[PDB]
Amino acid sequence: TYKITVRVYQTNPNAFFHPVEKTVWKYANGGTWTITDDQHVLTMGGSGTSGTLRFHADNGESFTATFGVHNYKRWCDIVTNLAADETGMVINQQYYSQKNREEARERQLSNYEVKNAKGRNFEIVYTEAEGNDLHANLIIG
Amino acid sequence: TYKITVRVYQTNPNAFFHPVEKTVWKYANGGTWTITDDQHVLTMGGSGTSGTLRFHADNGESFTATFGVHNYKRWCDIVTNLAADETGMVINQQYYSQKNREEARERQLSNYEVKNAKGRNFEIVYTEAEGNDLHANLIIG
Ligand SMILES: CC(=O)N[C@@H]1[C@@H](O)[C@H](O)[C@@H](CO)O[C@H]1O
Ligand SMILES: CC(=O)N[C@@H]1[C@@H](O)[C@H](O)[C@@H](CO)O[C@H]1O
């Protein structure tokens, strides 16, 4: 099994984001999202699956942060500028069907950042980036 | 918009279930799962969508409880004896393509119960079953 423990950092007082969806993809015997000490903990049955957290702010901004393991190496991606019909479960499935998402997963990134249309930065950084007990920061700008 | 507020009653000390996935379907401008006063709150953009909570117990038992609005009336369904590849997001999507799930949704039930292979009962009952501010108990046997 693989575990990814996620700590969320919010740095900008002009918004407040909160989790509104948490999904687990069906490969590698699935998995579970739970909470321990205010951290989001994804446990997966083996290498080859992932889970997505969707966040929403009062001002209408939203994004997904997806975490997984591909051929025993961690990966992550952020999708911003979400339309109302781009829920977390829609995005999570796309990592195994849609070319640009698949390629993001295949990059096996220990860190990734992107800006939305409003210019806000979002970053994931794995602070424990190897082995079966993985830890990442999600930093919202 | 439609809101469904869910209170979880665990009645049997021989197991302990906790939520491990919370998904939102893409129709009707999607929606959001949040928590207020230990209650799971689903808000949806209009009629025609739903959200799934998956629960897991440390003895290996699990189930999905899905809540939504179909043709302006609440619906619910429970799926248990889940295979490892039947995550919450898998089940949630099935309500919009798999005929038996579609039919369960279209029944617009305000009350439903079912047993798993171990003989445990699971029940959803809407205590406020009318209008746009809906309230349900999820009762674990
Ligand atoms: C601006 C933005 O969010 N771009 C995302 C990018 O971060 C992601 O790597 C890619 C593939 O999933 O999808 C894009 O929509
Ligand atoms: C034992 C069990 O979970 N049976 C479920 C039933 O409750 C549900 O109405 C139906 C359609 O979704 O799918 C079955 O697998």
Side-chain angles (χ1 to χ4, degrees):
Chain A
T1 60
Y2 279 81
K3 185 186 279 181
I4 302 174
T5 299
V6 182
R7 287 163 171 189
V8 183
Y9 292 83
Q10 303 196 59
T11 69
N12 194 338
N14 75 8
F16 186 77
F17 288 85
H18 59 278
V20 295
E21 199 177 348
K22 61 202 198 177
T23 66
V24 182
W25 181 240
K26 66 184 187 176
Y27 294 170
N29 293 329
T32 57
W33 278 107
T34 190
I35 300 160
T36 305
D37 305 337
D38 273 0
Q39 303 163 122
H40 297 280
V41 180
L42 174 61
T43 298
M44 293 158 288
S47 179
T49 196
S50 60
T52 297
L53 300 176
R54 184 167 55 101
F55 291 84
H56 190 86
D58 277 346
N59 67 5
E61 287 178 64
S62 68
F63 69 97
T64 55
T66 303
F67 306 86
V69 179
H70 175 66
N71 294 323
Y72 310 101
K73 299 288 290 190
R74 91 279 89 181
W75 71 269
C76 63
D77 189 43
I78 299 161
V79 184
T80 72
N81 303 326
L82 301 177
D85 65 348
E86 289 184 303
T87 59
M89 59 178 289
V90 169
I91 296 301
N92 204 345
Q93 183 186 348
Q94 288 172 351
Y95 290 101
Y96 308 91
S97 296
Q98 188 178 301
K99 192 186 178 278
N100 62 349
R101 304 237 199 282
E102 291 173 331
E103 289 172 347
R105 165 173 56 80
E106 292 181 317
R107 281 190 274 273
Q108 295 160 315
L109 299 177
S110 58
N111 53 95
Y112 181 68
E113 62 183 338
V114 71
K115 296 184 203 302
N116 68 10
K118 293 172 180 173
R120 192 182 306 274
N121 201 63
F122 306 89
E123 188 177 41
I124 293 161
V125 181
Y126 281 85
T127 62
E128 302 193 51
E130 304 296 346
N132 301 80
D133 183 48
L134 301 155
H135 299 252
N137 299 333
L138 173 61
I139 306 162
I140 308 176
Chain B
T1 54
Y2 283 87
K3 184 190 282 181
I4 300 174
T5 300
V6 182
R7 288 167 169 188
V8 185
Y9 289 82
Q10 296 200 62
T11 71
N12 192 340
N14 77 3
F16 188 78
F17 290 82
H18 62 275
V20 294
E21 201 178 345
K22 315 189 302 190
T23 67
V24 183
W25 182 239
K26 70 183 190 176
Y27 291 173
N29 282 336
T32 55
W33 277 108
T34 52
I35 299 166
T36 305
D37 304 348
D38 270 2
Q39 311 162 117
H40 295 279
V41 179
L42 174 62
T43 300
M44 293 160 286
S47 180
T49 197
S50 60
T52 295
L53 302 174
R54 184 169 53 104
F55 286 81
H56 191 93
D58 65 11
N59 72 4
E61 291 179 63
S62 64
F63 68 97
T64 56
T66 305
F67 308 84
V69 174
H70 170 69
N71 208 234
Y72 318 103
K73 294 189 178 183
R74 85 284 93 174
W75 72 271
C76 62
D77 189 43
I78 296 158
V79 183
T80 192
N81 305 318
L82 299 174
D85 61 357
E86 290 185 306
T87 57
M89 64 176 288
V90 170
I91 297 296
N92 202 344
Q93 184 165 4
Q94 286 173 351
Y95 290 103
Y96 305 91
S97 58
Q98 190 179 299
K99 192 81 177 284
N100 65 327
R101 303 234 201 281
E102 295 178 336
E103 292 182 349
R105 166 172 58 79
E106 294 188 356
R107 282 191 280 276
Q108 300 165 314
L109 297 190
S110 71
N111 171 234
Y112 183 67
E113 64 178 288
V114 77
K115 304 176 190 287
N116 67 8
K118 293 182 72 190
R120 193 180 305 276
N121 195 71
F122 307 92
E123 178 177 28
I124 294 166
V125 60
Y126 285 80
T127 57
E128 165 57 284
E130 298 180 283
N132 294 61
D133 179 51
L134 298 154
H135 297 261
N137 297 337
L138 171 61
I139 310 97
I140 309 178

